[PDB]
Design an enzyme around this catalytic site. Structure first.
Site, PDB file in Angstrom:
ATOM      1  N   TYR A  73     -12.668   6.146  29.408  1.00 26.13           N
ATOM      2  CA  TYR A  73     -13.477   5.704  28.294  1.00 26.13           C
ATOM      3  C   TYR A  73     -12.722   4.811  27.354  1.00 26.13           C
ATOM      4  O   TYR A  73     -11.503   4.911  27.222  1.00 26.13           O
ATOM      5  CB  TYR A  73     -14.041   6.868  27.524  1.00 26.13           C
ATOM      6  CG  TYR A  73     -15.414   7.205  28.023  1.00 26.13           C
ATOM      7  CD1 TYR A  73     -15.698   8.452  28.503  1.00 26.13           C
ATOM      8  CD2 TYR A  73     -16.490   6.178  27.986  1.00 26.13           C
ATOM      9  CE1 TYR A  73     -17.056   8.797  29.012  1.00 26.13           C
ATOM     10  CE2 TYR A  73     -17.736   6.490  28.452  1.00 26.13           C
ATOM     11  CZ  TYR A  73     -18.040   7.849  28.986  1.00 26.13           C
ATOM     12  OH  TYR A  73     -19.303   8.140  29.446  1.00 26.13           O
ATOM     13  N   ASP A  83     -10.833  13.957  21.723  1.00 26.92           N
ATOM     14  CA  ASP A  83     -10.064  12.730  21.813  1.00 26.92           C
ATOM     15  C   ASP A  83      -9.085  12.593  20.652  1.00 26.92           C
ATOM     16  O   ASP A  83      -7.922  12.239  20.845  1.00 26.92           O
ATOM     17  CB  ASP A  83     -11.021  11.547  21.900  1.00 26.92           C
ATOM     18  CG  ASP A  83     -11.962  11.667  23.074  1.00 26.92           C
ATOM     19  OD1 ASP A  83     -12.971  12.391  22.964  1.00 26.92           O
ATOM     20  OD2 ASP A  83     -11.678  11.049  24.107  1.00 26.92           O
TER      21      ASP A  83
HETATM   22 CU   LIG Z   1     -21.035   8.735  27.507  1.00 30.56          CU
END
Ligand SMILES: [Cu+2]
Ligand SMILES: [Cu+2]
Ligand SMILES: [K+]
Ligand SMILES: [K+]
Ligand code: NA
Ligand code: NA
EC number: 1.4.3.21
Lengths: 620, 620
Positions: free
Chosen positions: B374, B290
């Site tokens: 996310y 990320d």
């Molecule tokens: Cu997770």
């Protein structure tokens, strides 16, 4: 109506009257423990029977008794005489603590030891501590406390700054005799004061802290009915209080649509042990069982608004017995309030264009107790998302010694000449489980690493395994942080919509367990503290991991004796006992008063619900 | 005037102008990364040079460049061509993510796969994910993304509820070619929606939550000067923001009396990796870096008062560059506020009669980012007592797959036919240490159990040991929760009043590290994640534990390469890299949107101060 209501003053007075009427509470008797018992399994079916258990001490030296009373029916259910050398001494009486300093003050051996150190007996405080079980055969069957000395220079002085090392005394608190005075040699008494309210030590107080105001203009979101029944954000429970355990949570349940779903039948801290790791004979006997020997509930603080508990606080003021069976209230001894807890759930979705944020909150039930120099906070939390958590907070003033010239492997230095012996603070949480009812089982879950090869050619796969604990002989378990070990309590007869048994997962902190040698007195007496997780089959008389009578009691009772029964725990009424604690090598920053440190555990739903239980939380 | 100030919009525009004038920003050029460089060691002497580091991509396939510019003097300091097959590809461009769905929509293989499944191509969203390095030699030196399909039934539908398993495509985002379509067979597309704002799913919203109002009638206790310099309750620091790392803390120091004492020179989350543990070839390549591949700061959310950050909030609105060198402000992207934190210290003393209670508080600096499905919150905390803490909060929507008939060892079921592949979220905190200055060392501290015997006759003693890490070859360490393992960073040349080196102790959560096989691509590319604690000698060019160019790099870059230098770290300028993460076996409760779960670490002073640093806190 509720059989789980707090004991009232009238109930305690009535127990006193029943005991008196039965000839069990004459002028030489003292109440060492008194508490209401929980309703029997299946009892809900029938009418109220409020029963109380009492441990009765006798100041003449006659044998003590364990008695159960039905206050409802005005009867003694059972009364048995105790052989204390076998089954254990009763908990220490508040009145016995003061005996020690008084008696030592006129003992020639004690006075000689103080004179050798040029200390004025009038200024010498004695910490009167539990005795445990060692090599002194004359102590067997006797109530002993051991005393350690600290100099108090003036009435408001912190005596803990001035330990008198090389000196310890043993006292029989019933016959009022000093049995032994041990002097291994003089040590300098540290001279620096530890007065944390003295401007000389604090310096000018900060003027930089602006107020943080926490209010609830419409009042709290929880309701309290029947004195101690709490309803909050789908949760239901009863807040009990016992003089030994402190705050006890009963009937923890969650309202999922139309169903009130049980989760935990009873949650408590059923023991705590504070073992010292300094091999000096002055302290090598030193182990506090704050719950079992001292009774932490009886020393609960009155909690001040704005200082101890901030925000919109609802208090309980539990009632306990004094030594004579008279009721006494602990005013504002339990705090209840809800706290904001940051973000609950959040997602900003590119594809849908929906941005979503919800806030979390938790219900808090807490109390604080003082045991000599130490002060412990006990906090239970319920979260919107179904998480249950406990946190212990340790503060107060650390227990001190001399700091040996040339250093120490078992004591740290806090100030010039001032030491702090290494020790632990270890708790046992007893969780009488009721995941969707009483038919429960426990699985140990470990991560499983996989080898690169056929079926895993890129070597990225990983998995997990679960092992059902089927009998008590298989149910004494240790932590494995490296493998992410947790324990799941499930109901094999209650499935979620995906056809999996509903469960809750226990997440431990994986702190070190009891460090003492396995052949030590403390390893036997605190056997529970040597392993992280125990599972037993429920039984009425299995209440504490150390048994009913811990004071001056050897091994032979408690969890190791319960587990030997090797009962079926696979889909049965079971109890989880989780050991967790702090290992404390004191730092300079802990002196002269210790900033809070914490330890605890939590349980999270694991397929208990059919989806997130917080989708109905509204935008803030 | 502070070299640590946030970048201005004008500074970014100035970089753009310098680059353009130098002929480095033609129509085919794209800025893949841009950030201000920190001052070099000891530069506080000379006058400042504000320098920016830039990665320039070229969409015609020409070689990219790494460029450093001085906005102070308006010059190009250096411009170096990169061989990406050797040193790695540049971070993914937001504009390349958009290419994937478009291109697949006209590919015959992709259309054939969708037609077999009776899916309208106009309704198929594609998650365009980083490619890593596997068995495809033709990918070397090419920029590839791999796409996974999700059906979106209508504009506001959550596509994550409808994964299309058995299908994956590879795309060259420069040549705009579909290099591969893999169809391993049809799996039912899960039909239930996951729309967490649909009343049909949420049910009636709760009306039981009463307001919690948090206010500061006199404003906050911290000051902000020079845009990003924070002073609060003895702490001093600068809050930076970088498009790759997000919030970065600089110059963390504590004012102890009349001395400003450094503690940490720079603190950041220098990488975060999300490896998937499903061996299906549809997802076995799936690993998000990320920070390194996506750039977490770039996707920082604008945070809403009353919603994301509650109370008296002070915002920073950092500026970053877009792909063309234009400044873009992230409005209200960083929250700063102080929070009440319960009891700080408490003791009720029998002997002195003094009852003492003080409350704790913490300074919070936080941001939230969104990476596809996310969402992650990054929180730094400074406490009154000198504790420094970081916490990551994981939420958003879980990444989904089909749930195989017969079950899975690597995927959990969230809803009928809906799977959630197992994965981890593992962070690396890079702590450029400065305990009382730059001369530091690290010791590993373990509890030491002792055997009953001479010198320990009661078998109660326990101790600890410390091992200095002297060279980088010895400085790759693992957790040992069972033995209470911690790491102490100290300054061997700065001693407290007791003649002991001042230090800070790092307390890890001891969660599992990277689970993948040691021979996997991910274990080589994310080697940092395989061990809990690394210590390196400081170097200007050692910024990330995974190296400068993480995208499609073959492995071994970053920490393993740094450590191989085997430099002296015993009383030197050193950097601690702590690995910590969550291992996620998704539960039903995580769906359709996941309640926050957390992980982190903290550091506490260890004889850094001469006594408690909070004795001057006044009573509430
Ligand atoms: Cu997770
Ligand atoms: Cu302690
Ligand atoms: K009655
Ligand atoms: K300029
Ligand atoms: Na049970
Ligand atoms: Na450093």
């Amino acid at each position: 109506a509720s059989p789980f209501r707090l004991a009232s003053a009238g109930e305690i007075s009535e127990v006193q009257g029943i005991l008196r009427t039965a000839g069990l509470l004459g002028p030489e008797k003292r109440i060492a423990y008194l508490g209401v018992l929980d309703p029997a399994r299946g009892a809900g079916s029938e009418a109220e029977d409020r029963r109380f258990r009492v441990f009765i001490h006798d100041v003449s030296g006659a044998r003590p008794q364990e008695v159960t009373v039905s206050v409802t029916n005005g009867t003694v259910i059972s009364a048995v005489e105790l052989d204390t050398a076998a089954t254990g001494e009763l908990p220490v009486l508040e009145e016995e603590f003061e005996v020690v300093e008084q008696l030592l003050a006129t003992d020639e051996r004690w006075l000689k030891a103080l004179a050798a150190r040029n200390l004025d007996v009038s200024k010498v405080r004695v910490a009167p501590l539990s005795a445990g079980v060692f090599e002194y055969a004359e102590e067997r069957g006797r109530r002993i406390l051991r005393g350690l000395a600290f100099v108090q220079d003036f009435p408001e002085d912190s005596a803990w700054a001035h330990p008198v090392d090389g000196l310890v005394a043993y006292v029989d608190v019933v016959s009022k005799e000093v049995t032994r005075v041990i002097d291994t040699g003089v040590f300098p008494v540290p001279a620096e004061h530890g007065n944390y309210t003295d401007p000389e030590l604090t310096g000018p107080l900060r003027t930089t802290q602006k107020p943080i105001s926490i209010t609830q203009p419409e009042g709290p979101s929880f309701t309290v009915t029947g004195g101690n029944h709490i309803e909050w954000e789908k949760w239901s429970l009863d807040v009990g209080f016992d003089v030994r355990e402190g705050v006890v949570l009963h009937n923890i349940a969650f309202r999922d649509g139309d169903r009130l779903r049980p989760i935990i039948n009873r949650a408590s801290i059923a023991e705590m042990v504070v073992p010292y790791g300094d091999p000096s004979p002055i302290r090598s006997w030193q182990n506090y069982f704050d719950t079992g020997e001292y009774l932490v509930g009886q020393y609960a603080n009155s909690l001040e608004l704005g200082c101890d508990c901030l925000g919109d606080i609802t208090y309980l003021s539990p009632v306990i017995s004094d030594a004579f069976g008279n009721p006494r209230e602990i005013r504002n001894g339990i705090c209840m309030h809800e706290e904001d807890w940051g973000i609950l759930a959040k997602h900003s979705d590119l594809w849908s264009g929906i941005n979503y944020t919800r806030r979390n909150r938790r219900m808090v039930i807490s109390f604080f107790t003082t045991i000599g120099n130490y002060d412990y906070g006990f906090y239970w939390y319920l979260y919107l998302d179904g998480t249950i958590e406990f946190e212990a907070k340790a503060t107060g003033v650390v227990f001190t010694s001399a700091f040996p010239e040339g250093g120490s492997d078992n004591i740290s230095q806090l100030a010039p000449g001032l030491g702090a012996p290494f020790h632990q603070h270890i708790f046992s949480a007893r969780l009488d489980m009721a995941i969707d009812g009483f038919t429960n089982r426990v699985e140990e879950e470990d991560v499983v690493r996989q080898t690169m090869g056929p079926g895993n050619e890129r070597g990225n796969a990983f998995s997990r395994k679960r092992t059902v604990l089927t009998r008590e002989s298989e149910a004494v378990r240790e932590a494995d942080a490296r493998t992410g070990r947790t324990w799941i309590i499930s109901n094999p007869e209650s499935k979620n919509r995906l056809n999996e048994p509903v469960g809750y997962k226990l997440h431990a902190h994986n702190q070190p367990t009891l460090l003492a040698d396995p052949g030590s007195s403390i390893a036997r007496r605190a056997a529970f503290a040597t392993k992280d997780l125990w599972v037993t089959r429920y039984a009425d008389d299995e209440r504490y991991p150390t048994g009913d009578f811990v004071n001056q009691h050897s091994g032979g009772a408690g969890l190791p004796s319960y587990i030997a029964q090797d009962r079926d725990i696979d889909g049965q009424d079971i109890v989880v006992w989780h050991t967790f604690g702090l290992t404390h090598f004191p730092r300079v920053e802990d002196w002269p008063i210790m900033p809070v440190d914490t330890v605890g555990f939590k349980l999270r739903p694991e397929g208990f619900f059919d989806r997130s239980p917080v989708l109905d939380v509204p935008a803030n």
